[PDB]
Design a protein around this ligand. Structure first.
Ligand SMILES: Nc1ncnc2c1ncn2[C@@H]1O[C@H](CSCC[C@H](N)C(=O)O)[C@@H](O)[C@H]1O
Lengths: 385, 408, 130, 40
C-alpha cells in the first residue's frame, strides 16, 4: 500500500497517466484493492492530461471497490475541471460537497474562481470572490493570483494596478505568473509606459532568479544559441512541481508575449512547453482528424497555438481540421458557441483564412474545416515587435 | 350523477351448444363479411394461470383416428354401414380430409347429430375460402405455379374419390350424402379448413385424432395467439385457454395458432388464407450478399433463439426477414459498416427484382380488392395471397433501410 | 460506456459474458447477467453461452453452479446443453450434479431418454450397491 | 419421468461380544436392585 500510493502520487504529480493506469492494473491483477488515496493519484494524473472521461471512470470505480473519495479527491477533480473551464462540472462537485458534509475550504474557492475565469464567466468569478470574504476564510497567495487573472483577462488596467500593488504591500514578492499578467493587461491596452516600468523591476530582481531570467528573455536579450541555455535552465528547475504549476506558468508567459508583440518568441516558448509534456492534448495529427485543443489555454496562448497550427497546416490530407475550444458538457448547448474562447478562435480564424473554418451543427465547441475545403486554403505572420 | 351523464351472431348459435353443455366465458361470437369470430366481450384480466375461455363437450365433436385403424369418437357409424367401407378405402396418410368429409356428410344425414344443427353455421360453397372451391380463373390470380399445381392435384384427388365411391350403383343411404361432386368438394373444404388435430386421452386410450370441434373452429388463426386448445381427459371437454398472465381487452379477437412454423403457401393449401405477418415466410435470395445476423436482430430488438424469435415497425415480417435473409455470424466479430451497406444495397436490388416479377404492385392489389363487387371468395383470397407476399418483400426493403442506418 | 451515459448493446454484454466464461470467471459472468436483466435484456441466450464456455474451458464445477442457478431460476436450457451437462458430469463421476440437472430437465418439460439414464447408470454401477 | 429415488434399508444381525461391550461403555456385577435404607 505504501509503495503503490507513493508511485501513483508521482504519476499524478507529473501527469504520467499511462504509468498510473499500469500500476492500477498491476494492483488489480494481484487481487489488491487500491486505497482511496491511490485512486486519487490516478484521478490527478488524468486531469493533468485533460482525460476527463478516464478520470471520472476512476472516480466511479472508487465507490465500486468501497474506497470512498476523501476531501483530496474532490480537489483533484476541481483543479482538473478548473483548468478546462468546466464550471458545469465544478458546480456538480460543489453541490455534492455541501451534501457530503464537507465545508468549503479555501482551495475549493480557488478552483471555483479559476473554473469560472477559464469558462468566460467573469461576473460569476468575482461574485465567488465577493461571497468568499463574507464567509470569512483566509485568501492565500494563489487566491490573489486567481482573482488577478480575472481582472487581467477582462482588460481592467486600474483594477489590476490596485490588486498588484497590494500583493507587494504585504511583502509577498509576487511570483512570475502575476508579473506576466501585468504585462498582458498593459500590453492589451498598448500602455507601453507601464510595460517598461515593470520590466525594469524584473531586470534587477536581486532576490528571485526566475524573474530576472524570464524578464530578460521577454525583451529578447537571451535569444542566442548559448544564451538560450540559461532560459532552459530555469524551465527545467520549474519542471519539478509537476504539470500543475507548469501549465499556469506557460499560460501567463505566452499571454504576456503575445500582447507585447513578441509573437515569434511565443512560438518558441510554446515549443519548449510541449517537449516537456505541457499541453499533451494540444495537437492530434492522424489520417482522420487534425485538431488543436485550446480549452485549457489563455487568449495569448490560444493565438500562439492557432498560429503555429495554421502554419503547419499549409505545409501539407485528413478528413477534418478542427479547433476544440469547449471540451465538456457545455458542448451540447448554445452557450458553448457563445463562449469567449469560441468567439475569439472563430474571430481569429475569420481574418486569417477568410471563411474556411465554420461552426459545427452537432457540437457547440468545435470549429471545423472539411477535407474538400482544406484544398481551397506562412498563413499567419510570426514576428517580434 | 348517473342521470346527468361485426354483428353479433345469431342468438341460437350459442344456444344450441349451450343447451348441450357448451360454455363460453367472457367471449362472444360475432359475424362479419369475412366470417365468424370469437371476441372478448369484456376485459379479461391476467391471472397466475391460463383462464378457461370455452368448454366444448366431446359428444358434440366429429373425430376420427389419425392413424389406422379408423375408429370414430364418439362412435356414430353403425356396424355394417357402407360409409365405413368408403372411409376404409382411403389412403391412410393423404386422405385424412376425405375420411372427415365422409363423416361430416354422414353426420348431416343423422337426425339426432349436433352437426345437423351446427352445419347451418358453416360457410357455404361460395363463402368458404378453401382453394378446393377455387375455379381455374381464381388460381390464375395466385401468381404461384407451385401452389396452383398443388391445388389442382387436391381438386383432382377429391373429385376422383367422389366419382369412384358415389357412382350409380351405390345404395340410397350413400347417394343422399353427396348427390353432386360440389357437395362432396364442399365437405372436404370444410374438413381441411376446420379440422383440429390433437393428441387426446379418452378413458385409458391415448391416440391422435382429427377432430371437427364446434365453436372452436370459429377461432381465427394468429401466429401470436392469445389462446390455446387443451384437452381435459377426465370429463372429455376441449378447453380454449387464454395465455397465462396475458391481459385481453374487450373486443379483442380470440385466436389460436392453426399451424406453427408453416408458411403462407401451406396456410393457403390447408385453410385458404394467408397473413402478411407470417414469421415463417421465406424469400429465395442468391446468398452472394449477406448481412450481420446479430446486428439485424439487435437493431429490431429480436431476441431468443432462431426457432423462437420474438419481438420485445417490427412485426412477424421482420422476424421472417431475419430467418430468410442471407446472414453471416462469427461469434463476436463486428461488421464493417461500409461492407454491410454494399450487402444491404445488393439485397434491396434483389428484392426489387422480385417485386418487378409481379405485373401489379401491393397497393394496386389492395385497391382492386376494394373495387370488387361480384368476386368469388377464393378470388379475393388469391389476390390477398399475392398482395401479402408483395407486402412481405416490401417490408424487407424497409427493414434493410432501417438496419443500414441504425448501424452507425 | 456506462460513464458516457450510453446503453450497452445486448451483443456487447454477450461478448463480455462469453469472455468471462473463457477465463473461468463465473462470478463476473453472473454479475454481467444480472446487468442484462437490469438493462431489461433477455439473459437466456447469454446464460446458455456462459455455461458452454465454462464446460469447454474445463471449469465443469463452475459450470454446474451457473447452470443450476439459471435452471432453478426458471430458464429452460437447450436440449443440446442438457445432454452436454448430464454426460460431462457422469464422465467425471459427479452423479449428484447429473441427477440434479436431469430432475430440472424434466421439470422444464424435457423428459429423460435412454441416453440420459445410461449416463447416470455409468456411475451408479460403481457404487457397490446393486 | 425419473422416479424420486429413495434407498433406505435396515438389517438385523447376530452381535459380536465386542459390539456388546461397545453398547455399554458399564458392567453390571451385583444382583442388587434398590437399597432398603436410602431407597437409592
Ligand atoms: N387470420 C386469418 N386471416 C384471414 N382468414 C382467416 C384467418 N384465420 C382464419 N381464417 C379463415 O377462417 C377459416 C377457418 S374456420 C375459422 C372461422 C371462420 N372464419 C368461419 O366463419 O367459419 C379459414 O378457412 C380461413 O379462411
Amino acid at each position: 500500500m505504501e509503495t503503490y500510493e507513493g508511485i501513483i502520487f508521482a504519476c499524478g504529480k507529473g501527469g504520467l497517466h499511462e504509468d498510473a493506469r499500469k500500476i492500477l492494473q498491476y494492483m488489480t491483477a494481484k487481487d489488491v484493492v487500491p486505497s482511496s488515496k491511490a485512486y486519487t493519484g490516478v484521478i490527478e494524473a488524468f486531469g493533468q492530461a485533460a482525460l476527463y472521461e478516464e478520470a471520472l471512470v476512476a472516480f466511479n470505480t472508487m465507490h465500486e471497490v468501497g474506497s470512498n473519495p476523501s476531501i483530496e479527491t474532490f480537489h483533484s477533480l476541481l483543479y482538473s475541471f478548473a483548468r478546462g473551464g468546466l464550471f458545469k462540472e465544478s458546480e456538480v462537485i460543489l453541490s455534492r460537497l455541501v451534501n457530503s458534509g464537507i465545508p468549503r475550504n479555501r482551495d475549493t474557492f480557488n478552483a471555483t474562481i479559476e473554473a469560472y475565469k477559464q469558462g468566460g464567466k467573469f461576473e460569476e468569478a468575482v461574485k465567488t470572490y465577493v461571497d468568499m470574504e463574507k464567509s470569512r476564510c483566509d485568501p492565500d497567495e494563489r487566491t490573489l493570483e486567481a482573482v488577478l487573472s480575472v481582472y487581467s483577462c477582462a482588460r481592467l488596467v486600474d483594477e489590476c494596478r490596485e490588486q498588484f500593488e497590494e500583493m507587494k504591500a504585504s511583502d509577498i514578492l509576487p511570483s512570475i505568473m502575476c508579473y506576466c499578467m501585468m504585462l498582458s493587461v498593459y500590453g492589451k491596452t498598448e500602455s507601453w509606459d507601464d510595460v517598461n516600468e515593470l520590466l525594469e523591476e524584473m531586470l534587477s530582481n536581486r532576490v528571485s532568479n526566475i524573474h530576472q531570467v524570464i524578464g530578460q528573455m521577454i525583451k529578447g536579450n537571451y535569444d542566442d544559441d548559448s544564451n538560450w541555455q540559461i532560459v532552459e535552465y530555469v524551465l527545467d528547475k520549474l519542471n519539478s512541481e509537476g504539470c500543475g504549476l507548469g501549465i499556469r506558468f506557460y499560460n501567463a508567459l505566452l499571454d504576456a508575449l503575445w500582447w507585447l508583440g513578441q509573437k515569434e518568441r511565443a512560438a518558441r516558448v510554446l515549443n519548449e512547453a510541449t517537449k516537456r509534456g505541457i499541453f499533451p492534448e494540444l495537437f492530434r495529427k492522424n489520417k482522420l482528424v487534425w485538431s488543436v485543443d485550446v480549452h485549457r489555454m489563455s487568449e495569448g496562448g490560444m493565438y500562439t497555438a492557432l498560429s503555429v497550427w495554421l502554419n503547419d497546416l499549409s505545409d501539407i490530407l485528413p478528413q477534418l481540421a478542427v479547433v476544440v475550444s469547449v471540451r465538456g458538457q457545455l458542448e451540447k448547448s448554445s452557450a458553448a458557441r457563445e463562449s469567449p474562447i469560441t468567439r475569439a478562435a472563430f474571430s481569429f480564424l475569420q481574418d486569417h483564412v477568410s471563411s474556411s473554418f465554420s461552426f459545427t451543427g452537432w457540437n457547440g465547441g468545435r470549429i471545423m474545416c472539411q477535407r474538400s475545403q482544406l484544398k481551397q486554403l506562412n498563413i499567419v505572420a510570426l514576428t517580434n515587435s | 350523477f348517473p342521470l346527468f351523464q361485426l354483428e353479433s351472431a345469431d342468438p341460437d348459435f350459442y344456444k344450441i351448444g349451450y343447451v348441450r353443455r357448451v360454455r363460453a366465458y367472457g367471449v362472444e361470437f360475432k359475424e362479419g363479411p369475412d366470417g365468424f369470430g370469437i371476441y372478448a366481450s369484456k376485459d379479461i384480466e391476467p391471472r397466475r394461470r391460463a383462464r378457461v375461455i370455452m368448454e366444448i363437450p366431446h359428444e358434440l365433436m366429429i373425430t376420427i383416428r389419425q392413424k389406422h385403424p379408423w375408429m370414430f369418437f364418439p362412435d356414430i357409424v353403425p356396424i355394417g354401414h357402407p360409409i365405413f367401407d368408403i372411409i376404409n378405402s382411403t389412403d391412410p396418410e393423404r386422405d385424412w380430409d376425405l375420411r372427415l368429409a365422409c363423416l361430416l356428410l354422414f353426420s348431416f344425414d343423422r337426425e339426432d347429430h349436433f352437426w345437423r344443427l351446427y352445419g347451418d353455421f358453416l360457410p357455404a360453397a361460395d363463402e368458404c375460402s378453401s382453394l378446393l372451391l377455387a375455379t381455374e380463373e381464381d388460381l390464375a390470380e395466385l401468381q404461384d405455379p407451385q401452389l396452383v399445381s398443388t391445388i389442382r392435384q387436391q381438386q383432382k384427388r377429391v373429385l376422383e374419390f367422389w366419382e369412384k365411391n358415389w357412382h350409380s350403383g351405390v345404395p340410397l343411404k350413400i347417394k343422399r350424402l353427396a348427390e353432386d361432386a360440389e357437395r362432396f368438394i364442399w365437405a372436404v373444404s370444410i374438413a381441411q379448413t376446420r379440422c383440429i388435430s390433437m393428441k387426446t386421452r379418452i378413458g385409458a386410450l391415448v391416440q391422435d385424432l382429427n377432430m371437427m370441434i364446434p365453436y372452436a373452429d370459429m377461432l381465427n388463426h394468429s401466429f401470436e395467439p392469445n389462446c390455446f386448445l387443451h384437452w381435459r381427459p377426465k370429463d372429455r371437454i376441449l378447453e380454449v385457454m387464454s395465455n397465462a398472465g396475458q391481459a385481453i381487452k374487450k373486443g379483442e379477437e380470440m385466436t389460436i395458432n392453426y399451424m406453427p412454423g408453416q408458411k403462407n403457401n401451406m396456410l393457403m393449401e390447408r385453410y385458404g388464407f394467408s397473413t402478411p405477418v407470417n414469421p415463417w415466410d421465406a424469400i429465395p435470395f442468391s446468398g452472394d450478399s449477406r448481412i450481420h445476423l446479430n446486428s439485424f436482430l439487435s437493431v429490431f430488438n429480436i431476441f431468443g433463439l432462431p426457432e423462437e424469435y420474438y419481438h420485445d415497425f417490427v412485426d412477424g415480417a421482420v422476424i421472417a426477414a431475419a430467418r430468410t435473409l442471407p446472414t453471416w455470424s462469427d461469434i463476436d466479430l463486428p461488421p464493417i459498416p461500409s461492407a454491410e451497406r454494399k450487402a444491404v444495397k445488393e439485397l434491396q436490388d434483389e428484392c426489387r427484382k422480385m417485386l418487378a416479377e409481379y405485373p401489379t404492385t401491393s397497393e394496386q392489389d389492395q385497391k382492386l380488392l376494394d373495387s370488387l363487387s361480384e368476386a368469388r371468395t377464393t378470388f379475393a383470397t388469391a389476390v390477398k395471397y399475392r398482395m401479402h407476399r408483395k407486402m412481405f418483400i416490401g417490408k424487407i426493403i424497409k427493414a434493410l433501410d432501417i438496419y443500414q442506418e441504425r448501424l452507425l | 460506456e456506462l460513464g458516457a451515459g450510453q446503453r450497452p448493446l445486448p451483443e456487447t454484454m454477450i461478448a463480455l459474458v462469453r469472455l468471462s466464461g473463457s477465463k473461468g470467471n463465473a462470478q463476473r459472468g453472473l454479475e454481467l447477467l444480472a446487468a442484462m436483466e437490469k438493462l431489461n435484456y433477455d439473459i437466456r441466450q447469454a446464460w446458455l453461452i456462459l455455461v458452454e464456455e465454462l464446460v469447454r474451458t474445463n471449469h465443469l464445477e463452475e459450470a454446474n453452479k451457473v447452470f443450476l442457478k439459471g435452471a432453478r431460476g426458471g430458464m429452460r436450457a437447450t436440449d443440446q446443453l442438457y445432454d452436454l451437462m448430464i454426460e460431462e458430469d457422469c464422465k467425471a463421476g459427479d452423479h449428484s450434479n447429473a441427477l440434479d440437472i436431469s430432475y430440472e430437465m424434466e421439470a422444464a418439460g424435457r423428459f429423460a431418454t435412454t441416453f440420459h439414464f445410461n449416463c447416470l447408470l455409468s456411475v451408479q454401477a460403481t457404487c457397490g450397491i446393486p | 419421468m425419473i422416479d424420486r429415488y429413495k434407498h433406505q434399508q435396515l438389517r438385523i444381525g447376530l452381535v459380536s461380544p465386542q459390539q456388546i461391550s461397545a453398547w455399554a461403555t458399564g458392567e453390571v456385577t451385583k444382583p442388587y436392585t434398590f437399597h432398603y435404607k436410602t431407597n437409592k
